Amino acid sequence: AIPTNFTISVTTEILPVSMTKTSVDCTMYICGDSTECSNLLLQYGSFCTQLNRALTGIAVEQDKNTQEVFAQVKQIYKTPPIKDFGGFNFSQILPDPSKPSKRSFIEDLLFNKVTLADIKQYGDCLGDIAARDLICAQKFNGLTVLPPLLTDEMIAQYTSALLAGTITSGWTFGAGAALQIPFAMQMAYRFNGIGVTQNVLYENQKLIANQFNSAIGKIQDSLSSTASALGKLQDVVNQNAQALNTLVKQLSSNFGAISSVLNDILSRLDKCEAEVQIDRLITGRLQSLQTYVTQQLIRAAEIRASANLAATKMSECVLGQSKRVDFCGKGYHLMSFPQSAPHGVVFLHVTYVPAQEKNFTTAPAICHDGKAHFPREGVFVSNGTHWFVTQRNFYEPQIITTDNTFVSGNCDVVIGIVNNTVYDP
Amino acid sequence: FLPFQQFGRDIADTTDAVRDPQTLEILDITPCSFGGVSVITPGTNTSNQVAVLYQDVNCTEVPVAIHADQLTPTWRVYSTGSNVFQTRAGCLIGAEHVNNSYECDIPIGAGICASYQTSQSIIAYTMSLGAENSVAYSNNSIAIPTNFTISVTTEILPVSMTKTSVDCTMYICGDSTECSNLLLQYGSFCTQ
Amino acid sequence: LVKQLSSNFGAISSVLNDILSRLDKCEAEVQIDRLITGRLQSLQTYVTQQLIRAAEIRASANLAATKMSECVLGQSKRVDFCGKGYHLMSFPQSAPHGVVFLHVTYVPAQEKNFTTAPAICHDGKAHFPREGVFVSNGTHWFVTQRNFYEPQIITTDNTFVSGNCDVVIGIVNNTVYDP
Ligand SMILES: *[C@@H]1O[C@H](CO)[C@@H](O[C@@H]2O[C@H](CO)[C@@H](O)[C@H](O)[C@H]2NC(C)=O)[C@H](O)[C@H]1NC(C)=O
Ligand SMILES: *[C@@H]1O[C@H](CO)[C@@H](O[C@@H]2O[C@H](CO)[C@@H](O)[C@H](O)[C@H]2NC(C)=O)[C@H](O)[C@H]1NC(C)=O
Ligand SMILES: *[C@@H]1O[C@H](CO)[C@@H](O[C@@H]2O[C@H](CO)[C@@H](O)[C@H](O)[C@H]2NC(C)=O)[C@H](O)[C@H]1NC(C)=O
Ligand SMILES: *[C@@H]1O[C@H](CO)[C@@H](O[C@@H]2O[C@H](CO)[C@@H](O)[C@H](O)[C@H]2NC(C)=O)[C@H](O)[C@H]1NC(C)=O
Ligand SMILES: *[C@@H]1O[C@H](CO)[C@@H](O[C@@H]2O[C@H](CO)[C@@H](O)[C@H](O)[C@H]2NC(C)=O)[C@H](O)[C@H]1NC(C)=O
Ligand SMILES: *[C@@H]1O[C@H](CO)[C@@H](O)[C@H](O)[C@H]1NC(C)=O
Ligand SMILES: *[C@@H]1O[C@H](CO)[C@@H](O)[C@H](O)[C@H]1NC(C)=O
Ligand SMILES: *[C@@H]1O[C@H](CO)[C@@H](O)[C@H](O)[C@H]1NC(C)=O
Ligand SMILES: *[C@@H]1O[C@H](CO)[C@@H](O)[C@H](O)[C@H]1NC(C)=O
Ligand SMILES: *[C@@H]1O[C@H](CO)[C@@H](O)[C@H](O)[C@H]1NC(C)=O
Ligand SMILES: *[C@@H]1O[C@H](CO)[C@@H](O)[C@H](O)[C@H]1NC(C)=O
Ligand SMILES: *[C@@H]1O[C@H](CO)[C@@H](O)[C@H](O)[C@H]1NC(C)=O
Ligand SMILES: *[C@@H]1O[C@H](CO)[C@@H](O)[C@H](O)[C@H]1NC(C)=O
Ligand SMILES: *[C@@H]1O[C@H](CO)[C@@H](O)[C@H](O)[C@H]1NC(C)=O
């Protein structure tokens, strides 16, 4: 069965690249604002020097996780003012200059589909506190969320540079300096990559372009329909917030003390007896902080794995063409287009998918006059009467010829060989 | 506050609202300190100068947020001055804002990076994303390489870390037999 | 881990000998139990952190093994998997607790502009190159390999024909040499 047509399918896959950087203050979390408790916490200071190290190790890592995913190329390319790509339309993915930022349409849709309910200006919390904002409680308990190093506009600039390089130079900009190439010729290179001769592209270029454009449209309404697709990223947000909330809730435990309120202990008991109770509370809250930091390290490792995968996909599919099966979309990979998303990346893998198969009769070789003929590249296909050489991924039959095939020995040992003449120019 | 209530408590169980017994009004208690102060510094053996980034505060209201009135005079210099600079992350004190852009030396955040430059001081600038290079494009123009370079790059990868073993007995219980006897019931933990 | 042995953990002292010399076994056992619990907690924290770092190192070592297989023992077509540029070879070098790969790569150096066309209409039939592209220095056209400027005259063996020359967008007129 040989395909006689194709479809240009655009598949969207989302990968979390980083998570919210966080910092913790032992002193104001455990021993809120009392000097009596904080004096007892000095002997445990080493433990915090561990904790503040580990969280710091996470925070820097997240910045690195973004960098190695987006800072592949340090040459910030700009798309040309003229959009002449052989009928291909990149408006929905290229930057839109009519916005304060450079986010494309698809990037805007992705951003609007993730909440990211986190900046609260310290001073708003000192005002309308009766609303009981979660972030205000976190900030009063010493749980601060550091901001990402790379601003969203800057990540969008990196994505725009990658897109411009990909469409204006193909993979040549990945392996050093960018080199010009008309987009149709680039697509011809890609088609040669997947094992279908380039002559089909120029014979169906408009159609292909139309299909590509249609596929892009199918992404837009798909991203503007429901937010479930970005569930990978939203979870990565929500979970982190969940953890912080749990931490605050975990301050409501006695841990064997007479009460969970430090001031209550210091008001009922004196320094005579309050020291043991405060020590119990300190040990419990330090254990809670250790649990939080360990869970954060687990999640940081998971996010590092995801970001390494994202960087590999950026290198092997955006900057090149991947021959790995299913690595970049279902089908035969042609290109990829990156799109920034909150704490993640989105890949639009465009793929060649054969569409209309058709039954055919084939033989492994052709015996012309004793010698067996094997095709240089392709298969022998018969429509019922004659035979032709056809490329594997497309139905482009042509008459058997001495240059289409090569001879190897006599035609007695090959099982399934048939009888036919071969044209000799 | 219902008439039988005097103290209000938040999710953390720490009292936050109190009914003042003398004047029958409700007052809220908030921490007199806060977290978010970050110290930016070149490595000592270079200089003792430092900058201070206060997170999620305008530098107009830093004195009340930090309560600079009760702080030492050495802290008040970092509360207000001519080196005030605002960022999306927060606002920065002790660093001179520079419109020029360089590579990131000491990342601050929100695309702002700091460095120690020249009279030596600390500058804070919006980091650059590398060289700007527009690429020509035409529907009938290509670029072909006529020459090449054989470039040898190096990359290092960790393979293993130090194998380590721990003796519970001599760590927890140096040489006392009493402690070693008391540690038997926790053997299931140590064997883990 | 060594430094964390200087914590009371709620005991009267962080030294077993002080507790055992001030208190008899009557009251010393509760203090020693508190110390044991705290030090066991410290050991568990250390072991958990070591497991995290071991996971990191295992990921790095899996990557190193994959690089050794796919670049030292072969030629990797994956882009930027082994150095920047097109991969030629790789040489390993042991280092303490790690490996160092020397990735020798091919990087095109000096680029030249050339006017190109997707195909060539010889006498109505369009010609497409087998391996290369059509490049014109201004007057004539040549088939050149993509990664190096090695022009050669258009020829029937260099190219192949498929259909008339009206459907291709951007085709140009030229002759093809027939040996
Ligand atoms: C290959 O598949 C495409 C699917 O689009 C076919 O193009 C469609 O053909 C029908 C009938 O002519 C039209 O109604 C549609 O408008 C076309 N769609 C597009 C996007 O162009 C194409 O005809 C098929 N080619 C072959 C040889 O079967
Ligand atoms: C590429 O696709 C868009 C469809 O989204 C084409 O039409 C434009 O769509 C945007 C949507 O906001 C409108 O603002 C424009 O007014 C539309 N312009 C036109 C001429 O229809 C767009 O035309 C396509 N690109 C090209 C070069 O045709
Ligand atoms: C393909 O061609 C060859 C010769 O042209 C055929 O070989 C003959 O087959 C018949 C039947 O077995 C024999 O009686 C002849 O002696 C063979 N002649 C030669 C020169 O080999 C062969 O049969 C043909 N293939 C098929 C399936 O018929
Ligand atoms: C291609 O590049 C190499 C260098 O990368 C050129 O070789 C140099 O040529 C100049 C002049 O002949 C010499 O001064 C250098 O010593 C050469 N360098 C080396 C390492 O050999 C080479 O000439 C270039 N070839 C072309 C066609 O441009
Ligand atoms: C390429 O070759 C074809 C065949 O010779 C040219 O076809 C005709 O050329 C004459 C003048 O040389 C024109 O009057 C005709 O209009 C052409 N035929 C058609 C259908 O247009 C063709 O002109 C050549 N291509 C170019 C761009 O000149
Ligand atoms: C090809 O032939 C088989 C057997 O008759 C049949 O089951 C199958 O549906 C056919 N496929 C097409 C595309 O005709
Ligand atoms: C098979 O192909 C040949 C050449 O195109 C044609 O003459 C013949 O009619 C075709 N036969 C069938 C059954 O399609
Ligand atoms: C293919 O299968 C059929 C049925 O088993 C058999 O008759 C035929 O000999 C097979 N083809 C060859 C070359 O043996
Ligand atoms: C005494 O208590 C009453 C009732 O709380 C209050 O109105 C008053 O202000 C307080 N002070 C004096 C001097 O009465
Ligand atoms: C703080 O700075 C921001 C800048 O947009 C401004 O919106 C806000 O009103 C300022 N708040 C105060 C109290 O100055
Ligand atoms: C830097 O940019 C600001 C924009 O408000 C401008 O006011 C200032 O004059 C500039 N300073 C220099 C040295 O360019
Ligand atoms: C190739 O052409 C473009 C536009 O004409 C030009 O910007 C570029 O510099 C040229 N390449 C070289 C190496 O000069
Ligand atoms: C282009 O190449 C041909 C090769 O014969 C040469 O004759 C001609 O002078 C060259 N023209 C230019 C502008 O380089
Ligand atoms: C290529 O671009 C030029 C000007 O931009 C235009 O005149 C010409 O029609 C275009 N040709 C093709 C095949 O796109």
Residue numbers in the entry:
A (entry chain B): 713 to 830, 834 to 1140
B (entry chain C): 559 to 676, 689 to 762
C (entry chain C): 962 to 1140
From the paper:
The S protein of SARS-CoV-2 is a large, 1273 residue, type I fusion protein, that can be processed by host proteases into two parts, S1 and S2. To overcome this challenge, based on the locked SARS-CoV-2 S-R/PP structure, we engineered cysteines residues replacing positions D427 and V987 to generate a new disulfide-stabilized S protein S-R/x3.
Further 3D classification after symmetry expansion revealed that locked S-R/x3 spike protomers adopt two distinct conformations that differ primarily at domain D, we will refer to these conformations as “locked-1” and “locked-2”. Classification revealed that locked S-R/x3 S trimers were formed by all four possible combinations of locked-1 and locked-2 protomers (the combinations 111, 112, 122 and 222). We observed density consistent with the presence of the pigment biliverdin in the reported NTD binding pocket in all our spike structures, consistent with the greenish color of the purified protein.
